[PDB]
Amino acid sequence: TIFQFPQDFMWGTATAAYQIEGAYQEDGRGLSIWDTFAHTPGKVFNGDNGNVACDSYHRYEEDIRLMKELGIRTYRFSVSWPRIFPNGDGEVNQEGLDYYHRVVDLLNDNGIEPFCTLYHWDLPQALQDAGGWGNRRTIQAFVQFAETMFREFHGKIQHWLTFNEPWCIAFLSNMLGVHAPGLTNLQTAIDVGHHLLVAHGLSVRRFRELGTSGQIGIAPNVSWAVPYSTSEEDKAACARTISLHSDWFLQPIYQGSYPQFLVDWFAEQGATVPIQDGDMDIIGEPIDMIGINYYSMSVNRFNPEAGFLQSEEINMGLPVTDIGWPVESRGLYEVLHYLQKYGNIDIYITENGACINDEVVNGKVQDDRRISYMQQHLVQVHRTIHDGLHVKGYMAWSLLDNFEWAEGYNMRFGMIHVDFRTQVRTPKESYYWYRNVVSNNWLETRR
């Protein structure tokens, strides 16, 4: 089978600042909650951290040359807040802005459209000291950050995202404690979720008022769960699992309210959303599109002992990636159709990839399993496009192997291999395969 993509389909790759930039104390960068987290024994595997990472702070030119050869149309990257406002609230660090000007200008010079992600988890530690996202003052700190970028990069960037993966930022980080700041409190997770939504709404307003160029949206990480049994309880369990990732952030944005069943669920656990008058109206600020991050899908059943959502994931025996996630691409098809509940909105798959740990052997990285994973998912993308959904682009998760948050450097997601000992980049076999797909603008599955 041959899968022809739309003429204007946007092909790209993506990265996040703390995962690739390696100059954590350079040019006046202040510490983020992630520097703090990684610097804490027991938080990240093997004590790895992003002090050096891929040193993309210094090696951006080579990376951009590589992605220019890839024949890619856009590059999604995140901005390091503590590089712009080291304190989070103080004065602007012109050195920080300069770095991103060097990067963006280079991208533009190379005909690659920057796709800017304002927040990708690196909250300045100073603000966390004052309570972080649990404190509404952070909402103002963020809007200042957003404005600075909107004004500084006006006609240079045409695609913007406020937050990347609100579910991870709020629940994984503050309820499960797996990601910075590493807290484990339901109410705290809810406060964070609510405040980032307000911050998001306000930033879009500013985007509009300043008349900044381009389109702006948010990129939630999406979950998809299917019930093990036909029981209403298993069905409910999957509804909770699915809704907390997307609906909890998208319903307020699109329909002016939080998913009531989840509101009632958390109420039973003693937590309530800190909604002030005017908040929901602010959150409902019209957005141009959303980014969708998809990796896996699960088969769940109701289990009272299965965490705060009482939704147990069944190990169905399916083959998994090197990080342990089963690959089942139908989930992408399913979730994109599910999201039509908000209308046939513009959607960009901002992240899709797999952890395949192959290394350089005889001068190449034979990551056949990454090519396989990607092929299956791109088929689902073509499928939705042909069902009439407005899926506008696809960004391969990870141009480069990087600091995988709590996994450290132990889990590789990149299309370009990075030997952290030498900083040497070696485009994997998936890279050359992808260069073909994006350049031909059509995909082919063969036996």
Place this chain on the structure above:
Amino acid sequence: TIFQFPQDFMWGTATAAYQIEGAYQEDGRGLSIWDTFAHTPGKVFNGDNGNVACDSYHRYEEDIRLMKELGIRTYRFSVSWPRIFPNGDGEVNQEGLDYYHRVVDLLNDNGIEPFCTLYHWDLPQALQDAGGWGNRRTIQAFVQFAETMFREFHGKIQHWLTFNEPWCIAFLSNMLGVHAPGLTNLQTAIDVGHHLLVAHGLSVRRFRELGTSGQIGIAPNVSWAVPYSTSEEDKAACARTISLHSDWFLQPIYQGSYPQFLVDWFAEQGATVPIQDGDMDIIGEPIDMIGINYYSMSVNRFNPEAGFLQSEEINMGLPVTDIGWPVESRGLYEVLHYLQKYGNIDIYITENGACINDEVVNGKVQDDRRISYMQQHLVQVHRTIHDGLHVKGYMAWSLLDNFEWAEGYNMRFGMIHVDFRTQVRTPKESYYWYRNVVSNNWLETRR
């Protein structure tokens, strides 16, 4: 995850006579349409045939010892018609009956319940000469065959199946010409399908009248297709693909009629079912259970050029077995629920397996992919049982590697490896894994 199975769940393996018995001219066996087919240049890969196969005609004792060590409860095998009635119509060949008495007695001696499949494609050539299943005289020849077996093996066998895979017998064999007799005529395929249904109905009547011991049913091979797009045409294409395999044979049996949409579909192609008065009533003879043969699932779309059903199968990029079939177990779950349209009938998974060609290396066959395939499917079986469906047992397709019909010996489906050069049996790693599941009566998926 741990998956506990029901106390009385029936675990087994299966084979077919022409695929394993290797004494095609021995003890007065007459030729079958398959001997003829395989003996024709270009019909079977590499000119392979079942002249010797696994020589199970002589090696049954070793095989039975091996399956006794497997801790299995039943063994599904087929009876070679041309061994019983070399002519198909003439007098009984006592030598043929004796062989099966040796086999059945041995199984019974070993506490393994025989699960007898009367027809597994080996129609005596003589009958094919007179028209085969296209001629109603064959229906009578079959009933004589069935009676002989019912009377001969009365209190020795408690589970019987009339036909195995009516779809392959009728359409693959007579419309697509891939299997014996290798014809390519729609009307002929429909005649065969209709006459085997009448033969089936009559044989059940005889089973009932003779008061033969046990239960009796039929074992259709099941297909499952999911639409690529949400279009009604793609949906219709899948309905045709699904219904021809099961509904076309099960609706007459359970609801007294053929699927009208398929009746209309074939009518458009100039073919009509040769229904005589009384036929549908005969076909509707109450059966005790059905056997279900499942291997794969597909994503289809409507395509006017895609064969007589105009249903094109999309290559979704999924990993495939060594014969090229993608593995997606959900299909088993889906089809079992779909079949509930005939009521919560007793169902036995009479066949489920995969072509994994691993050979003996360092004394063992490391068929990890077969273990993987099986695990995923057994999970679906437990799932349906827990949804309340009456799935009564599971038979691993192929105790032994064998003559894979048109594929020859080139495609291995067994849990026990057979070196066709030496006839040496080497139980694969999947065998020992299965021995554990069937003996423990519970399965566990682990990372």
Place this chain on the structure above:
Amino acid sequence: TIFQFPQDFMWGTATAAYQIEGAYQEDGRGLSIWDTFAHTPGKVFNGDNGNVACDSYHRYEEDIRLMKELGIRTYRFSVSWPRIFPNGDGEVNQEGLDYYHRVVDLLNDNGIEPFCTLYHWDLPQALQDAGGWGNRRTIQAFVQFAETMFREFHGKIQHWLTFNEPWCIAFLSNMLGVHAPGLTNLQTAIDVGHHLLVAHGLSVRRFRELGTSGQIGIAPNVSWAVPYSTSEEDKAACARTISLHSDWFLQPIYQGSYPQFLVDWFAEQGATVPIQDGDMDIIGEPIDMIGINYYSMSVNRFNPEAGFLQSEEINMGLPVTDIGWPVESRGLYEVLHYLQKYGNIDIYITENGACINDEVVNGKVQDDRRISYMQQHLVQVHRTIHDGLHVKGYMAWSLLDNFEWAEGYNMRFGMIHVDFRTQVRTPKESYYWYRNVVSNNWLETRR
């Protein structure tokens, strides 16, 4: 055995523009029917194309250095028409001419004689839009192209070829649809064949009138078939196979007429050659020599179902190259003697090579099978020379691995390996072997 070659024997290698130059949109190059063809899903394997190829547009200096070390005397290359006349008819693109001046001057500086092939399949798309070779206007467009080159490179090139492989240009491309433009119409194939012959004749006239330096000819790809049985029908089948490749283009050129039996053959299929008064006289323009491209030989039999020539090729069990062609060098000896029907004309083996896919292992490409293939064929060349035939030179097909038309980059024919990921050149073992043969001017077969 030692095979001493003539003192003035011309040793070389060959390439084609679209196969190696990799700057399809650079310096005003217009699209060719091959850019179009390769850019169409399903036309070329894996969607490969010549956008980059070997990037010889930029790497010619390295290649020329490498072929200078090879000790070669001439280099056969083709000119990209759409680089000279982007439209095919419009004004000259001086940038295009400049490139070839850089190449030719460098060759000349290195004592390597350029052997210029004006047409190697890259017809400007614009002309194809107007009908391509099916339209006589294209004949004029071509003559303008030829003149431009004759005048531009006057005393720089001494060997010229009008067309390379007329059989592929006409029949493979327009009847079988395997090569650009991918048509499947007999009459169209015949029109193309006839118009390229007229174009050829006219261009030789211009060559003569302009007093351009050197010699000029045409290079048909040669076929050779031997009958399976002694039957007249098998004999006729081979005559058709042989004659369409060579006689169909050479008889008009040398004897003023088309092979009548083939004329009658196509007449039976409803096609007739569009011959205008004066055409045959133009086509009969005296040429200095011909180039012969040979790769394989076959054993054929008459078969009414075997394509438009009803000549079936028998798989004799002979070993084949990696692209599936059996190697049997006698065919070269046979065809060269056969061609004596046109007189003892000057013949240059413009192409001879094999697809051997060996890659770089431990720093080298151990292409022993290419050395083997070449040795066998060079023996046949010496043989004909000693039978008194005027075989003047031998050009190894493919200096570099390249874009193999419909095969993509999947089939390697070069003596110098190219890693398309890095553009790195690695001379194969056949290169060093050839360097010895061409430098010593004698070959030795040893046990």
Place this chain on the structure above:
Amino acid sequence: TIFQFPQDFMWGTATAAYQIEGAYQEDGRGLSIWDTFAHTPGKVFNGDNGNVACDSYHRYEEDIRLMKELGIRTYRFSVSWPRIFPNGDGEVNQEGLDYYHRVVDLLNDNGIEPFCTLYHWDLPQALQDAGGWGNRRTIQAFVQFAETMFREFHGKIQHWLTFNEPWCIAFLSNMLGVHAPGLTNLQTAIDVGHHLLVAHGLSVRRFRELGTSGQIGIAPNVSWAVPYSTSEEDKAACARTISLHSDWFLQPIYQGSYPQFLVDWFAEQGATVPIQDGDMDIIGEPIDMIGINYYSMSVNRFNPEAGFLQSEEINMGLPVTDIGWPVESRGLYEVLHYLQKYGNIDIYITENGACINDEVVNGKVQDDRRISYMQQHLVQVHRTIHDGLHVKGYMAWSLLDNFEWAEGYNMRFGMIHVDFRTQVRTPKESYYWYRNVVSNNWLETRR
């Protein structure tokens, strides 16, 4: 391509007594010229000999079981003269006859038709002492031998051959000195050749007079040479090469005379055929068929220094077997057509095989090159059959690896590997391939 063979086509394998029987002093066997030759330092590679060989004298039952599994129809073997008449002239050794009765009876019991070769080079030393084949008394000794066998095995054998490879017996052995008795004298070679022809004629007479069962013929080894150049001298050189192997023995047999050009050739070298009155008439005794032994083909040129035939063989660069012979099957097709000069006589390919030295690795002998060689030659056999020639059967040269005359055990020609250290037989991959061809009675060449 599929090559269907005739219903009654005779498939077999072949061996020679001294090459496989390993009991040189057992049961009163007298020494042969080959025992003597091999026991001489410098005559056979590594001083190997046939003292033990494959020990088929004791292991015949296993071999026969193996060839019964091969599905073969006939078995060609030779009789050890010094086992029957240890002296060559004295009284019969009943022990010797008994051995062959054990062998023949077993073959017959297994439905394998014995194809008896009376003389396969093992002349009793005693006779060689008296001059061997150079002495006409040997002619009488041979006829006694023949009669003994004809009478002893009357209704047990239906196919007989007098001599196997007269060219090797006469010229290779007496002119070139490569085979026993190792002489190097033209006249001696001619005497041997003439006396074996007289011996042959007389033995056929006895066959006829005794009314022995079956058919009888002779099996010359065939050569085929093609001229390098079109020169009459090269053409003559090939005529000499071809004619000495076949015509020199077949023209006397079929046309009552020796090839005059060869007679004149040897006359120039001072040798003349010792023809007595009545000799040619005796030699012309009508025979039922001939056996043809073919292995290779060559391209020759006239060279005054190239041996007694002044025919030099050119190394064309073609791939060779492990013994150094190039494989080119067309030669079989060519020679069979050439032999039609004697009429469309019945011909059996009594020997065809290749030296491929693969050993047992992981329990098997992966002799793909033997399968390849055989496939190419069987195609030529089908081809001639379809050209209407009476090629009646094919015998694979060497059922077992054996004592390869002057090569010792260093060159393997068998389909069944023999470890001379253990005498263990391991059927090679070619064996299983052949089992399929002979059992299906059709061959298929595939890519």
